[PDB]
Amino acid sequence: LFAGTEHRAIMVDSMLHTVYRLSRGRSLTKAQRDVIEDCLMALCRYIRPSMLQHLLRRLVFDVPILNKMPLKLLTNHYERCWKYYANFGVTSEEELHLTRKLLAHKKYDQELYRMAMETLNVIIPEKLDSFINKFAEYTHEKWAFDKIQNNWSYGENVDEELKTHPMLRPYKTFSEKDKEIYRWPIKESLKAMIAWEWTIEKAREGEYNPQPPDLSGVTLSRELQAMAEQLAENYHNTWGRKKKQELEALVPYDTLTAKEKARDREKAQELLKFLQMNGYAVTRIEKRFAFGFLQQLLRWMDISQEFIAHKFFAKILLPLINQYFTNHCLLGSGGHASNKEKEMITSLLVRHRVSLFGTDAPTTLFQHIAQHQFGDDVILDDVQLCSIYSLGTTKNTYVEKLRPAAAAMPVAFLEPQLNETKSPRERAILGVIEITLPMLCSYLPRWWPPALPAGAPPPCTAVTSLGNILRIIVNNLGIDEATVFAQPIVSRARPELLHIPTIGRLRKRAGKVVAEEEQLRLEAKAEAERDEFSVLCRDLYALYPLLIRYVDNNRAHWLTEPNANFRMVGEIFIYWSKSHNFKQNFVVQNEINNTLKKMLPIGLNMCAPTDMLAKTRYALKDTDELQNNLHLQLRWQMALYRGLEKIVRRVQEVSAVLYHLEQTELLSKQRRRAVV
């Protein structure tokens, strides 16, 4: 019910603090604190992250430097994953703090990766006594300029209803009783500027309705803005140490609010502009993570060889998880590539997943050629260790698909692949005339292990480029028509069913469907009749064959309806009984899945309706009540369109519709603890 509190944001800001004030304490048990820690994260949600940063400034002050503790880490991760689809610097400060911190070790990386997206003893110089009066005089010169604009009257006693300013005069017209309000402040700030950087000397010329001069004539440079940043924190350090001494007898500068830092910065931007007069000018994001990442990458491979010869390893595990986090969360491109080649030699699972991530995130050519040389050497060993090569055999193929989004060394491995985990060898393979001769060779083989592997890159080669691909599909057609490794065979099948040739494929696949239809009817006859498990096995094999069958049938239908909108009428009629047979058959199908039976009926529905619907409505009723004898027993706009063997064809489509129509179609409390 606390959703959207733009009504009020101060009471909830105080309430959110005193809850976490009650989070750690001496006078509470495990039971009472678990109520509050569950009450806290229940309030971390159901409120907008506008008001969330009011405590997030206070948490990163306390927790992330130390390895109570989990109460911070829990509430943190439930807020940083609350907007990923000012305080940001505080988080990165905490991000490095947690890295400095890097059981309790596993309780940290989750919350971390979720956030991955002297003035009294200082001597005053000669001009510093002249600047403590001038920054007191320019302060009285700016204050009388501001108050009199809002109709501030002049009174001997300062009244608020009268807006009286009895200090409406200069510091040179003020005595020790009227300049004591600006004596210690302009002298301690000049002493704090001198104790920070010992430069108090005149090096430039100088610059009641008192008006301050144009002090904003020159802006802040790279050394002036840093000194103005040094003047705000020093004014916050002296006043902050004054608050820590007075209340004992608390907001910093860098982790200040967006509203608190707006009022504190005017005490330094006006003081450095007041110091700049009379020459007394005291003048002394992800790549940072990537720098430390490469810094960690150096010590990792150093330690990796230190164990290869025979604390940080957990930190390496802590980093790789964050590495897998940031890669998925995603000059600097080189730095990642530098780390990419850094980790690859260390391999020469957990890192490999991060390696697969980093390859998915996509000097190294030497590393590639050395790997390719190591691959062919392993291929020499394969023709004749295996674990370090097999993980490299997929990471390369990951990269070989990555860059698509040392040519000879690749070609050397290709011949080694052609020489002799056969499917994995067939996997990275696809990732001219010599191919053309082999193209007709497999075509002759289709006219009749390495036969499956050779067709992989051949599908990858023709796709890189018309009727040649049309021949390859027909070669792939008869190979399955004769027919496992049909799954990866089907993976390249839908990859290039783009580009007459379809009509030849239509005459081919119509035979493919009818053979499957006869195989379906045989199993249906087997279903009409131990032999029950065998029929279940046979249907499973039939479902297995139907899986790769319909997969090419879909994309081919994406051009058939594009064209014809005949042979498809046969193809609809053939696939009609298939869906009818699909209407225990699904039970074997579902196990084979662990669909295409549905989508086949979808594309065929448009074609079958392309060839009086009340009779179709009537014949659907008899098919929901054989009906072929019962079939024997806006329309002006429609007949304008439709005009632009019926007794069986109408009977054919009708039952298909009805099949598709069918296709689209307490305990008491003590009883619960009893059964437990």
Add this chain to the structure above:
Amino acid sequence: ISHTDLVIGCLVDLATGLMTFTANGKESNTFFQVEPNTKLFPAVFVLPTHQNVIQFELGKQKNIMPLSAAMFLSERKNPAPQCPPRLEVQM
């Protein structure tokens, strides 16, 4: 920051087409004169800066008839100020 209400009243003389404007009973320097056969709508343009902004006051001065008699032909002789519901504020 003024704690008082600037009241602006206008004066339109129909048989001459002469238009003048009074500021708190003190006549302003400006004036306006128009063609014979023309009409006019009373108008106020404002960018608001308060919870309560303006008030249209349909009143008469010491010897002149209010805006009710001007716009309703059945009541041209009545000097009592009225506001029937056909009158309203457009935008």
Add this chain to the structure above:
Amino acid sequence: MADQLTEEQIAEFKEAFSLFDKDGDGTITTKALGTVMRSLGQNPTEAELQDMINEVNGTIDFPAFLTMMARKMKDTDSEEEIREAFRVFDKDGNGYISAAALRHVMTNLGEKLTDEEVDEMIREAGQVNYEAFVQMMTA
């Protein structure tokens, strides 16, 4: 209900209690209650000590001692019972119990649940895990 403890604990408790019994009366001091639990290896801090005496004068009598011993061991067994309760479902013991293997283990346990409620148990909950199952049972 003080029956949720077995006998030998009460045998161990009375052995511990009589060892630090003041005069054989069965009275002990407020401090000795902390020492006798640390004589039994249990180490709770003074927060878990403070709320227990005011739950029940400085004089702790043996039934007044024992009722606190029931509650300290009632809550701990109340949460560790339900993971080992899921252990008998899955053939491995991890949490992966198939839903097919449930509609005969649940109508055959002895609370006389018929087919309708073990249906009603299921469609108001493939294999389901354990932590959703301890959620759907405790409710």
Add this chain to the structure above:
Amino acid sequence: DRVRIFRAEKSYTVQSGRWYFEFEAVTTGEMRVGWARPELRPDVELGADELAYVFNGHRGQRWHLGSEPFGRPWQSGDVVGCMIDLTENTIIFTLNGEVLMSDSGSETAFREIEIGDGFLPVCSLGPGQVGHLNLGQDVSSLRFFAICGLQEGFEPFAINMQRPVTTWFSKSLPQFEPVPPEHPHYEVARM
């Protein structure tokens, strides 16, 4: 200036059946086509409030109470059909005869829409953009309706109308109007 909003007259609302039209887009850019509630305010951006359902062809996203990416952006000279089926509370957008899908693969751009007072077709043209709106008087004048929509069951809009459907455009000339008493910011009081 602003964006012009185009629609049909409020008599021509639909309450049932399944309907369809077509829309050629000549020069791509900022345009918007879809379906809208009849009580449509001409001040708002088309689809920002709860009165419109409208696809955007500049970057390929749907507009209703915000945005969500949807399908491919445009070319110069492609047909963007729209169709609705009130019997199932669905809205389907077809591009060039091919049915657009979501990021989840679903073709139905919006489901579970309340029928209410009805719907009526709506277009929107940004500055410079040119595109004609074939509302479907002559069936042969349509192009990609036979590819998709015909055998599905969708009838065109002006299937039996011997006169063309009158169109209502949003002006740019401001005119006076009485202040509504349910206005969220302004209110008057005749004392």
